[PDB]
């Protein structure tokens, strides 16, 4: 049993967005399907219960329903605004072995920013780490709204991927992110290749420049 739920889905502020919590091998009319809400850096809270009743302290926006035609649940969030940016979950006593299965977790965002063009500032390595047994690489694609990145690493000879250490972006008030991938390659085998590039095909801007071992 697994509560299928999309990873991330949102819309422009002002529409009505719904989230599906389709089960796997359990009758929809078995128990009640509830929903939660967790803010980044805090504890989750209950937003609905029994799929039809609303707790005291919730505006008249979250409206739950039940769709027995496909054994799934929904949540009509009318009037999408900035305070709705949170992580929702699901709960249902679905199991003959006394085990509760939670939802996947939808990362509802605010699709208010129309478009943000990213920028990449390729940085070559330094001399402090290249002394004996260290080597790094910086790409630093920043100033982009869509957090979904498409960073790729290949030294013109093979898709080198074992040893990639990418950093998650940071949320800012300007609706901009900053991705920085650190490809940890082999220090002693630097002579195997002579060019390392950062080819990111993110929507808005793309670069494919490379570096040099010794200039």
């Amino acid at each position: 049993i697994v509560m299928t739920q999309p990873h991330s889905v949102s819309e422009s502020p002002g529409k009505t967005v719904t989230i599906s919590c389709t089960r796997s091998s359990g009758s929809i009319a078995s128990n009640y399907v509830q929903w939660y809400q967790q803010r980044p850096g805090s504890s989750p809270t209950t937003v609905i219960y029994e799929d039809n009743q609303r707790p005291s302290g919730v505006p008249d926006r979250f409206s739950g329903s039940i769709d027995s035609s496909s054994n799934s649940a929904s949540l009509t969030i009318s009037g999408l605004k900035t305070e709705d940016e949170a992580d929702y979950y699901c709960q249902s006593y679905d199991g003959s072995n006394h085990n509760v299965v939670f939802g996947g977790g939808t990362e509802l965002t605010v699709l208010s920013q129309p478009k943000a063009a990213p920028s990449v500032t390729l940085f070559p390595p330094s001399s402090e780490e290249l002394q004996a047994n260290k080597a790094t690489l910086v790409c630093l694609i920043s100033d982009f709204y869509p957090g979904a990145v498409t960073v790729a690493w290949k030294a013109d000879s093979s898709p080198v991927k074992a040893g990639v250490e990418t950093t998650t972006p940071s949320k800012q008030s300007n609706n901009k992110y900053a991705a920085s991938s650190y490809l940890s390659l082999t220090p002693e085998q630097w002579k195997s290749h002579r060019s390392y590039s950062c080819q990111v095909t993110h929507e808005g801007s793309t670069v494919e420049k490379t570096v040099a071992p010794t200039e």
Binding site: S119, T121, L122, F123, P124, P125, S126, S127, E128, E129, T136, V138, L140, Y182, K209, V211, E215
Partner: peptide
């Protein structure tokens, strides 16, 4: 700390930046 030296890829065209790991 390792300085992110902008040797030639951050001085030809556009702005410049440098950081530390």
């Amino acid at each position: 700390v390792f300085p992110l030296a902008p040797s030639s890829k951050s001085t030809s065209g556009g702005t410049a930046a440098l950081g530390c790991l």
